[PDB]
Ligand binder design. Structure first.
Ligand SMILES: O=C(O)c1cc(-c2ccc(F)cc2F)ccc1O
Ligand SMILES: [Zn+2]
Lengths: 331, 331
């Protein structure tokens, strides 16, 4: 019974240039002190997010994992690195460099630090090419943002990407990014509190109600972050609309709630009643412990909510380790 | 045990000429078909939306209330009537006209049909004086939309309006409308399944995280539709951000979940487990039966989810009737 944290992020140790050989204004880089504990992600010479040392330092992170009791942590790019709005070839070179950084990071201890890759998702060919390349090099899967502008997961290019990954047994973690709401949610981190769970819910519903799950091979292993946003709580309203409105059944021939056997979520819902509902909707085999480490909006005592819950011990063990080791092929 | 449905809408018998008194191009009017069972909302000469008889005909609505077992229904404007983007004086005159149409609609059976008023929310002084005028004239409260373009409920103008209504014991219903993310949600009722719960959550959180609930007198009676949207499920994630980031705390001087004593929600969450969670979060005193009627009835039952639940019979009575009688002052 290891403990696997399958939701965490890292940021590479990349110079101001290097980073400017791709873009001054938009390719991010890492500015670090001599004090060492402190650093910032820089865009050009702007700032952006001060960052904790465990975001970039694998040795420092291993100490934190020991204190938290985490045996293995899956980690992957922070969304600022995605580069989805870039010229496709530049973005594919970026992705390759980023995925090499990730393996370098995990090389500090590959038995305990696993990595997921990013892909140049705005170009299907380059995206599939990089997915297979990165997995052949030791990534256990791919992490993508959930949409490309107005194209959600039901978009043909995105469905085709999931189908490539399914056909090569490449697991997918879907992360919300580029949040809806435009000019509205500008204070108190409302984007993270409102738009992000809606982004994830939209991604799941897009796959379900478009019939995408009818087209995508059952072999796809896909997991959505942050418990799947509000998906589980709003499922009853979805199922009701499907039963009583033929326009909700136009492309989806089964009740939406039956498609929970096609994806996974992590457990980061931050509430005991929420977790129980979530497990009740997804089943104990489809929730995996994830923490959003090392970000402040993550779970501070990793696995605290699952271990202190009232679920059976078989359930707890699946969530903290059994499911993710099967999902990602970890021993 | 008067079964009360406190969440429903209507649209009046507005002729083209009546609407041309305000805006020949943008004031909506109702073109009832010659057969009388369907109609169109119109703007000028253009067809805007097809509508069903129950929307405009109070006598037919009584028929459906009887079939459904609803003894009293609270109704108020459908959002196309709001007029928030209009010049302020025109919008105030329109609001008074609409609020008169509502009283005329309720006059068909005022024991069983109660109404709430609309206000020209784009002008503080005009909005509060119409609020007082309409409540004196017989309205039991106000229904506002949840946002005015990019201005959410934390906007000073809107906070001030709620304070006015708190101070005069004018209850308030918040109806989500003009949904975010529209260019992405054009099939399968996604605006109502995804954007609408988010809109409601955003409205609750904008009052909390801005500290508006701290400055708004506790006398305010305010209710959010559709169970509060995803608010109750995502509250843990909100608390775990308030704990851990200063900027989530800058204007909210207590943990967000402590404000669940400051508002109400209707019971529309379409799922027993989701309802239990909702009552667990809000308490049996702050959930009110509300259906968003008119909708095609079919096999569905207003209040069926609540009555068939496992809550205390005492709790059901509060949800079915007790809470709305106290909230709106009905006997
Ligand atoms: O505490 C914060 O400010 C915070 C920040 C992030 C975050 C940081 C950097 C980045 F490129 C993207 C992010 F979502 C993610 C979560 C979070 O809580
Ligand atoms: Zn994350």
């Amino acid at each position: 019974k290891p403990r696997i944290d399958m939701h965490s992020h890292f940021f590479p140790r990349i110079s101001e240039q290097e980073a400017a050989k791709f873009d001054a204004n938009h390719a991010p880089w890492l500015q670090v002190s001599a004090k060492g504990d402190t650093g910032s992600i820089m865009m050009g010479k702007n700032n952006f997010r001060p960052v904790y040392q465990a975001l970039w330092d694998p040795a420092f992170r291993i100490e934190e994992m020991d204190a938290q009791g985490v045996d293995v942590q899956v980690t992957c790019a922070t969304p600022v690195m995605f580069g989805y709005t870039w010229e496709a070839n530049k973005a594919a070179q970026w992705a390759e460099r980023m995925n090499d950084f990730a393996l370098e990071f995990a090389a500090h201890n590959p038995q305990r630090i696993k990595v997921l890759a990013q892909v140049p998702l705005q170009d299907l060919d380059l995206a599939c090419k990089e997915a297979s390349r990165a997995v052949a090099a030791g990534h256990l899967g791919i992490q993508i943002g959930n949409h490309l502008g107005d194209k959600d997961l039901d978009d043909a290019t995105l469905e085709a990407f999931l189908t490539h990954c399914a056909n090569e047994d490449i697991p997918i973690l879907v992360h919300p990014w580029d949040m809806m709401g435009g000019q509205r949610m500008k204070k108190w981190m409302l984007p993270w509190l409102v738009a992000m769970p809606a982004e994830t819910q939209l991604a799941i519903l897009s796959l379900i109600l478009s019939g995408a799950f009818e087209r995508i091979p059952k072999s796809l292993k896909i997991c959505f972050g942050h418990g799947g946003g509000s998906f589980a709580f709003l499922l009853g309203r979805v199922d009701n609309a499907w039963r009583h409105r033929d326009i909700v059944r136009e492309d989806c021939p089964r009740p939406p709630s039956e498609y929970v056997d096609r994806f996974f979520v992590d457990s980061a819902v931050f509430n005991p009643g929420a977790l129980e509902l979530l497990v009740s909707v997804m089943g104990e085999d489809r929730v995996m412990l994830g923490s959003d480490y090392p970000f402040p909006l993550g779970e501070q005592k990793i696995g605290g909510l699952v271990l202190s819950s009232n679920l059976g011990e078989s359930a707890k063990d699946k969530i903290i380790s059994g499911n993710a080791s099967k999902f990602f092929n970890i021993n």
